[PDB]
Amino acid sequence: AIGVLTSGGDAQGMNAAVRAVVRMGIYVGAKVYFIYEGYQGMVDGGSNIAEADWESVSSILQVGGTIIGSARCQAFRTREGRLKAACNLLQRGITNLCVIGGDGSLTGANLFRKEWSGLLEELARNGQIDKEAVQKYAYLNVVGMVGSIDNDFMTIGTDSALHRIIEVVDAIMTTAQSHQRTFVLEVMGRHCGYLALVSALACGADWVFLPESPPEEGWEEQMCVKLSENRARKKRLNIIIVAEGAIDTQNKPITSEKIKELVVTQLGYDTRVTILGHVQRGGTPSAFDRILASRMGVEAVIALLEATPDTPACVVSLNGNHAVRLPLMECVQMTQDVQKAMDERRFQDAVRLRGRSFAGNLNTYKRLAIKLPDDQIPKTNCNVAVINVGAPAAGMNAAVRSAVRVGIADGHRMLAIYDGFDGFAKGQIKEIGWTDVGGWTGQGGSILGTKRVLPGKYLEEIATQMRTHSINALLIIGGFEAYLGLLELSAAREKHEEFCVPMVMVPATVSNNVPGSDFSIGADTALNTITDTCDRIKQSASGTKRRVFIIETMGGYCGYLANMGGLAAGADAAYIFEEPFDIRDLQSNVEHLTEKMKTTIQRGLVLRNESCSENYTTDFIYQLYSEEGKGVFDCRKNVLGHMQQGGAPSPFDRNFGTKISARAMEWITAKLKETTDDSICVLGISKRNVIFQPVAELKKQTDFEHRIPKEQWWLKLRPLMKILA
Amino acid sequence: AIGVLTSGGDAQGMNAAVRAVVRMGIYVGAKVYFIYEGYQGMVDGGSNIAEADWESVQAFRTREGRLKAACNLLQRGITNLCVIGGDGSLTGANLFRKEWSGLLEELARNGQIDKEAVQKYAYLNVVGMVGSMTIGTDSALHRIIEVVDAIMTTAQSHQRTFVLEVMGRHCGYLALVSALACGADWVFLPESPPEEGWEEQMCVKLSENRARKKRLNIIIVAEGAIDTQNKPITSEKIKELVVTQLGYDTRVTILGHVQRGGTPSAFDRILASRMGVEAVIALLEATPDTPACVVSLNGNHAVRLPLMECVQMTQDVQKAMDERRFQDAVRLRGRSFAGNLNTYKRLAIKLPDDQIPKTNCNVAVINVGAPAAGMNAAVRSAVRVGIADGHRMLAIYDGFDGFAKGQIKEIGWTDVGGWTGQGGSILGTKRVLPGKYLEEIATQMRTHSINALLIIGGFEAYLGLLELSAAREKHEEFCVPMVMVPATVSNNVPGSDFSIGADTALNTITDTCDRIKQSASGTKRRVFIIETMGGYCGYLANMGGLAAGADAAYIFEEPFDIRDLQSNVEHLTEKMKTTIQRGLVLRNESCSENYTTDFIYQLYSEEGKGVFDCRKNVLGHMQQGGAPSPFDRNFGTKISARAMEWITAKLKETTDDSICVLGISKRNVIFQPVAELKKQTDFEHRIPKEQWWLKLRPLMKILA
Amino acid sequence: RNESCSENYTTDFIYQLYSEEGKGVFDCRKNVLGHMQQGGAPSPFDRNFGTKISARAMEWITAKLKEAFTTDDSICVLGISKRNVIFQPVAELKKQTDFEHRIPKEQWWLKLRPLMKILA
Ligand SMILES: Nc1ncnc2c1ncn2[C@@H]1O[C@H](COP(=O)(O)OP(=O)(O)O)[C@@H](O)[C@H]1O
Numbered sequence A: 001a002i003g004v005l006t007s008g009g010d011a012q013g014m015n016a017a018v019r020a021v022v023r024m025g026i027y028v029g030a031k032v033y034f035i036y037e038g039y040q041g042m043v044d045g046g047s048n049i050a051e052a053d054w055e056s057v058s059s060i061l062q063v064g065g066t067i068i069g070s071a072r073c074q075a076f077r078t079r080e081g082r083l084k085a086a087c088n089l090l091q092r093g094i095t096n097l098c099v100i101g102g103d104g105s106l107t108g109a110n111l112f113r114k115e116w117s118g119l120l121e122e123l124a125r126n127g128q129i130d131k132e133a134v135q136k137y138a139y140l141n142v143v144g145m146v147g148s149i150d151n152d153f154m155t156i157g158t159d160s161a162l163h164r165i166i167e168v169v170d171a172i173m174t175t176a177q178s179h180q181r182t183f184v185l186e187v188m189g190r191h192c193g194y195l196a197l198v199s200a201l202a203c204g205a206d207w208v209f210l211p212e213s214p215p216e217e218g219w220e221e222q223m224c225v226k227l228s229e230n231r232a233r234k235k236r237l238n239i240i241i242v243a244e245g246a247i248d249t250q251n252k253p254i255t256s257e258k259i260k261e262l263v264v265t266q267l268g269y270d271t272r273v274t275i276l277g278h279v280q281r282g283g284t285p286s287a288f289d290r291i292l293a294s295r296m297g298v299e300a301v302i303a304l305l306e307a308t309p310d311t312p313a314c315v316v317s318l319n320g321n322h323a324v325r326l327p328l329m330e331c332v333q334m335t336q337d338v339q340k341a342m343d344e345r346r347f348q349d350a351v352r353l354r355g356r357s358f359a360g361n362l363n364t365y366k367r368l369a370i371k372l373p374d375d376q377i378p379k380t381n382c383n384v385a386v387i388n389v390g391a392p393a394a395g396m397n398a399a400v401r402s403a404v405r406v407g408i409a410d411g412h413r414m415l416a417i418y419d420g421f422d423g424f425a426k427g428q429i430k431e432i433g434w435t436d437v438g439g440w441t442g443q444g445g446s447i448l449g450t451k452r453v454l455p456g457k458y459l460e461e462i463a464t465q466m467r468t469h470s471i472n473a474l475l476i477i478g479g480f481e482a483y484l485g486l487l488e489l490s491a492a493r494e495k496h497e498e499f500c501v502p503m504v505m506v507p508a509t510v511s512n513n514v515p516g517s518d519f520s521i522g523a524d525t526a527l528n529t530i531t532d533t534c535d536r537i538k539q540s541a542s543g544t545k546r547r548v549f550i551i552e553t554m555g556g557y558c559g560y561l562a563n564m565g566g567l568a569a570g571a572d573a574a575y576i577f578e579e580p581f582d583i584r585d586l587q588s589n590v591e592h593l594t595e596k597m598k599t600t601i602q603r604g605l606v607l608r609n610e611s612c613s614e615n616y617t618t619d620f621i622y623q624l625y626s627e628e629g630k631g632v633f634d635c636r637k638n639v640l641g642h643m644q645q646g647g648a649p650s651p652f653d654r655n656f657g658t659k660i661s662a663r664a665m666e667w668i669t670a671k672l673k674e675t676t677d678d679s680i681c682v683l684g685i686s687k688r689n690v691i692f693q694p695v696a697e698l699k700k701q702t703d704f705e706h707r708i709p710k711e712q713w714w715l716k717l718r719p720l721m722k723i724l725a
Numbered sequence B: 001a002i003g004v005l006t007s008g009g010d011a012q013g014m015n016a017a018v019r020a021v022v023r024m025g026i027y028v029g030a031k032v033y034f035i036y037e038g039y040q041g042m043v044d045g046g047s048n049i050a051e052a053d054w055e056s057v058q059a060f061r062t063r064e065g066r067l068k069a070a071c072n073l074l075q076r077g078i079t080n081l082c083v084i085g086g087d088g089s090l091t092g093a094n095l096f097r098k099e100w101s102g103l104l105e106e107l108a109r110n111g112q113i114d115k116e117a118v119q120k121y122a123y124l125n126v127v128g129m130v131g132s133m134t135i136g137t138d139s140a141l142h143r144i145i146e147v148v149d150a151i152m153t154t155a156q157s158h159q160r161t162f163v164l165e166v167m168g169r170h171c172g173y174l175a176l177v178s179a180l181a182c183g184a185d186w187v188f189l190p191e192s193p194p195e196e197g198w199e200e201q202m203c204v205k206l207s208e209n210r211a212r213k214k215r216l217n218i219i220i221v222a223e224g225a226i227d228t229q230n231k232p233i234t235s236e237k238i239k240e241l242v243v244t245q246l247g248y249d250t251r252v253t254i255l256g257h258v259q260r261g262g263t264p265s266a267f268d269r270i271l272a273s274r275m276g277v278e279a280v281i282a283l284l285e286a287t288p289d290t291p292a293c294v295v296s297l298n299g300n301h302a303v304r305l306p307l308m309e310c311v312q313m314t315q316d317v318q319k320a321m322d323e324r325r326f327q328d329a330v331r332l333r334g335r336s337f338a339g340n341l342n343t344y345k346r347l348a349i350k351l352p353d354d355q356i357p358k359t360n361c362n363v364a365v366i367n368v369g370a371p372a373a374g375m376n377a378a379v380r381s382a383v384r385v386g387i388a389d390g391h392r393m394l395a396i397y398d399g400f401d402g403f404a405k406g407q408i409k410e411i412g413w414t415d416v417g418g419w420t421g422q423g424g425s426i427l428g429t430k431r432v433l434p435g436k437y438l439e440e441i442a443t444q445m446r447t448h449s450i451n452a453l454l455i456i457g458g459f460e461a462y463l464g465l466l467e468l469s470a471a472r473e474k475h476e477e478f479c480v481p482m483v484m485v486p487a488t489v490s491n492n493v494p495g496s497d498f499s500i501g502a503d504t505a506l507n508t509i510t511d512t513c514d515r516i517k518q519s520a521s522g523t524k525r526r527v528f529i530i531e532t533m534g535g536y537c538g539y540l541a542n543m544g545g546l547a548a549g550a551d552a553a554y555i556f557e558e559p560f561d562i563r564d565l566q567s568n569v570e571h572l573t574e575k576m577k578t579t580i581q582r583g584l585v586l587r588n589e590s591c592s593e594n595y596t597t598d599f600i601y602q603l604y605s606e607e608g609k610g611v612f613d614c615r616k617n618v619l620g621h622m623q624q625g626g627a628p629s630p631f632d633r634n635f636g637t638k639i640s641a642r643a644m645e646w647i648t649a650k651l652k653e654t655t656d657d658s659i660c661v662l663g664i665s666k667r668n669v670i671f672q673p674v675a676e677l678k679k680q681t682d683f684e685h686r687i688p689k690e691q692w693w694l695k696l697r698p699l700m701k702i703l704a
Numbered sequence C: 001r002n003e004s005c006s007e008n009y010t011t012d013f014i015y016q017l018y019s020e021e022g023k024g025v026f027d028c029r030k031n032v033l034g035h036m037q038q039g040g041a042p043s044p045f046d047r048n049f050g051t052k053i054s055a056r057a058m059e060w061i062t063a064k065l066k067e068a069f070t071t072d073d074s075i076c077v078l079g080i081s082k083r084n085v086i087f088q089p090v091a092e093l094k095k096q097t098d099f100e101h102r103i104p105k106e107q108w109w110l111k112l113r114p115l116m117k118i119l120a
């Protein structure tokens, strides 16, 4: 038997995590019990512990919060409580625990496992039979999942919280614009700064205050200088993000009110403070959080099955896009050590302890917020060109912004090419500066413009422009055509010397079909649009009852959107190109759905990637389900279309765009401090790492006929859709 | 020449208002100038006054300023002013019109030629638009309800009480209508203080909620909430009170300036557009004998209210507030304010069961047609008003399908708790009509002793009523009072100008159109052909077209041919020469049997070759939507409450007048016998014969 | 495939199923014959059927007129029924007709359905 509970602050995605624990549990043939109101429900026992069936967790995954409740329980901190808690579990035969919560909830579970010796006091007291003390003894497997928006310890709810913050910032930006105003926004993260940092990065904030890294003396003047510069630059508003637990090098709090006093005093600007508060914990879970929570739920169940008495309690986690089990005790220690470092004022150590990507976000943030005066930037005599190629993808503008500003910070001269290779061939090229890309981070589309056309038939005109504009390097932000483009330019090197320069691309496309990257800029935005659209369609179906929607999604031959969207939306099926399916597979899902209509959940959702089959079209499927569903359910078909691309990029796509482009520019600058295969590369994400791969080496790994990679990491998740539905 | 400016606090929709003043201005053959930075830009002059073309879309409190302001206008030949702002901005314009004859000081000084003093004299037409139904209110309300919906998930988890401070230091309309829209547990308004003993009354309500097992409380507090002694009631004091008396876990959130931000709702965009057009017209029609006015929307008609009278009105409310003429304050806010207030209190506070005088009647509630956002709010309201009136409420599930199958169960006050913000239909809704199931349904009415019927639904609800009316002679079980409220995304129910759900759909369409335009910056030279829902009813395509700034919206109610199509293609082709190289064409799904979404896509593609390309998108059932908009929540709630009052009244006493549609008609909500609606209905296409919104078709040409 | 044999299982549907499940073994083509089926010159059978049946109808008309109508029996279908050509009142044919699909309820040739199995 398995008990699942939620403790500490609630986080969006908890319901998904619970959903996945119950369904994976049941699918493996275990019994699963909800424990309501966190530990308190464990202590109180009784109706607070209830067995969960397949039906109990439908309609839950798209909702914020925890449907089974959470609570700070003082009774569990006492020995008396844990004794009663332990007793209640034994009554239900529950020796497997899954705890979803923060630092505190998991330390509580750590403690509970150590003291599972409490069973002896059950023996000494009336409590339990001796057989029980031996039968359930040290047979307490505990697995933890972190669910705090803080990222205190990637955590469930962080992405959702960030969507929340950025929604507020984007809303505030229209009102700050009117006349002129400076806004001071207090965001969550008690003693963690991750949220503030990543929000700042995501909105191009003018200043940020973190607990892990205090400001340093003289910040008051530095900040006011920056704000005066902005007014001189005519920027119609300022945004300053402040972590709840922002502090002095002396550990004194820096409050939002003090920041306001400072700005009004020094500069007399019109200033307002907004404390976002608990809104950050609310709203619907993002696509990322739903998928993350699902993978974690499934992994937590597996960990429990596989656990031995010799194996220590673990926390399931995602490291480098792999499911890992970290010793719970070690993780608890880690969290104390950061606070220790903070208290002792070893602030560099605090940042070190938060991990590689934390320092990455921090350095990248500063680089893009604070421009050294021109005189200070030495300059070197290269011109670096930036371009967009392929369909538009949310996050392209953030990417250009970052590349330009890093380029300028490195003393290059930045050239913007407009309309992809179309504009390139036509000489649509202009210098671009730091100020030009101001405000781009949250802008959807492509401001430079993007086209699909390939360079191959325009090699001479393009070579001319490179010579004409003395172009020393090229950064291409774009999709599969960007990659084909690089291949063409690589091949054209022998006949045109102008292409014997360093060239790199970052992947930007809604489809996520670029070889050399697990992720592409824009796909998270699309997933969020698909997921929201599916939530609605499902509601429509649940209003009518006995209805199945067949929904066509984008992606080309790339199944990423249909598959991940399917998971995030709770679809019953997702047909993709990468997994052949036949009429037997189709009949089988129809029969499954027909069974499902005998239950309470009388809706269905079937996703079909647009190019998944030449014969088994969206209509074909619609017709089969319709005909074989007769008398039990009816269908509707919907082709989502271009609206899936979505609009403004999600916080993930903003920051992906920003970070990955910054990294590409560093590589360009480094190459210029010095032409063959290794100078024409795709900068992609590969399991934990961002890496530069020669386009020549990516050919072997690519299916050119269908424009998808040969190996796609996410196909290992296919079993999850079956299970989770 | 026309000058347009924005003053006072900003509001979402202001840009739409400005857009419409410029375009209507130019279309009428006037010249239009933007005046930047409100009155200051008028005083400073210079580049702060700029002429506007088609493509584009303290010192005033002193006499010295106004003199310079007046001068700057005369230089540009501007004697027509459109001011978009609040109380203060409009009083400023009132004052400026009074003192215009101090063009004479321009004469005495070198200022101006005498010819000018006579040529532009008392020829200052001023028209005002309020931006602080007023433009931006609906948007602000979307903002508040987004925050409340988000907070509800986290309060759930923790069994927590939330105290939310919303805007309104002087006016309580936002807090009131937010409370109504989220089923808040308590509300505090400036116009209506609580009354002594509220502390205990509020705590009793919260304890009752816990006993009812409600996992959270939401208390909405206007910024300027006050006691009968005008002392502030703050959100902190409310928190102290709850923690003290009940010891519940309580948190306070001050929404702040978020409420002024975000994108304009569909309603605000359309409202602003109609107000902009109406402001220009008022200016043209104005004479020197004509007083300065404020354009407004009263009962869905464009009206011009004397500006001076409106200023006086505003003072009078603050005056009443000063001496505790609190009833007078509420009186002065208007009929619909008191309406919202009474409806809110009815649904928030249940008298103890012993207290409520019992009818012996059972009243049934049902959903019929496709799902529409706001249906659950409607059920909630009807149920609770029914119980408050001492009836027993029966929920019928799955429309007439469940009705014929006896899927009927008593439902209570607690059962409908939390429904207000829930999309879909929780009872379930089906399209099937009663006609072939009359005996089985008659049986259920008899079996469950059903005394009256409220149907929340679409055109099939109306057909259903017709069938049940006709079946009265053969079945006495249908000789009961029956009423329907319109719920459908399509807005095609005869007898109503609006239906529950359509606003939500409009907002979905509008948001989707915005998103498409935000993407696609990359190709430029693109036109989207977008298919919308509505059946034969053009409301969604048309109103969506306006709100989204579409270049065309093809609908069934206005035949169009290949010439009309060729003509819009040529127009768009011209538009691609300009800077604004992105086109939007909406097509109602049933607007033509031959001229399909693909047909149009194909024509525009082929004739646009070398100039632009197209994409098509069929939006689909997402339009049925997710959570209802604040308007649909409150429409649902209010209209259903009204229907239940009518039922209770009828039961204190069958012919044509007992089977009715409760619909909105020009300023009024009215009960119309279904027999009288037949003549007014096109049954072949399921739409009304006369549709109020078709008078707006010229606007899209003008505003595109 | 009869054109209206199924609302979902269309000519394309079938084409697609047979194509997909025939992969590696056979391919398909689809053809909708269309209005050519109406036209051309009639076959000898249709000429002579037309001729003979109409002649017979005219005889009946003549015969009815010698009586000089309000009976059901004066409004008829002259049809072929197992060896016989017979006049049937349209009122009596209503019970035998599926008006929704415009076909007779009983169709003689359905007894031949087993033959196609056997003969192919
Ligand atoms: N050191 C501990 N020992 C026992 N239980 C704990 C401990 N720390 C936290 N808890 C449990 O977790 C709950 C509070 O969680 P908290 O400390 O806020 O961390 P988080 O909210 O991040 O999980 C309490 O109800 C308590 O039962």
Ligand SMILES: O=P(O)(O)OC[C@H]1O[C@](O)(COP(=O)(O)O)[C@@H](O)[C@@H]1O
Pocket: A390, A391, A479, A480, A509, A510, A511, A513, A554, A555, A556, A642, A645, B615
């Ligand atoms: O998959 P790609 O070729 O990177 O392009 C992404 C976009 O292109 C599409 O295939 C549609 O093509 P268009 O943008 O040219 O209309 C969508 O799937 C997606 O939005």
Ligand SMILES: O=P(O)(O)OC[C@H]1O[C@](O)(COP(=O)(O)O)[C@@H](O)[C@@H]1O
Pocket: A636, B369, B370, B458, B459, B460, B488, B489, B490, B492, B533, B534, B535, B623, B624
């Ligand atoms: O216009 P109606 O018939 O009242 O129904 C409203 C809904 O029905 C639709 O026509 C769709 O019908 P279906 O749900 O049966 O496919 C849409 O136009 C609209 O959302």
Ligand SMILES: O=P(O)(O)OC[C@H]1O[C@](O)(CO)[C@@H](O)[C@@H]1O
Pocket: A008, A009, A010, A102, A148, A149, A150, A188, A189, A190, A244, A281, B251
């Ligand atoms: O929900 P409470 O009790 O206000 O706690 C607030 C704290 O909890 C957190 O959500 C951490 O889990 C932080 O956002 C915040 O610092």
